[PDB]
Amino acid sequence: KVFGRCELAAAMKRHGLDNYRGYSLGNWVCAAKFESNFNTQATNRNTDGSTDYGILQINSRWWCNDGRTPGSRNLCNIPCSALLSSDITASVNCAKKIVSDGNGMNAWVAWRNRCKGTDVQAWIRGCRL
Ligand SMILES: CC(=O)N[C@@H]1[C@@H](O)[C@H](O)[C@@H](CO)O[C@@H]1O
């Protein structure tokens, strides 16, 4: 599923991402924009053999199991395919654990390089949130 901008912000708010760990809703929408272009089916292979999955491009090296990342962890206790569904519950729950482990939203390369220090509020502007 390819979310609309305001559609994704509502779903992120309903699951409790707004101001989670201090990051306003515009940060999460901006991150999803530049990580997956709002596509829940997005995948990308990293050079070390791991794969990023879903709306927030969650890495199989630590957070999910895909059966083909030797020596990796499954800290969110889910199959990586669960991160590709049209329901973003699995992605949001796993993102809450990722963003809680000390480094905040810097675990998302696209957020650090393309959202951090910008007007992230613009990504939820006009939305009937
Ligand atoms: C939180 C998370 O898993 N972020 C990933 C990161 O692992 C990886 O370096 C990158 C590769 O494109 O995409 C995402 O930022």
Ligand SMILES: [Cl-]
């Ligand atoms: Cl915001």
Ligand SMILES: [Cl-]
């Ligand atoms: Cl594996």
Ligand SMILES: [Cl-]
């Ligand atoms: Cl949803």
Ligand SMILES: [Cl-]
């Ligand atoms: Cl932080």
Ligand code: NA
């Ligand atoms: Na894994």
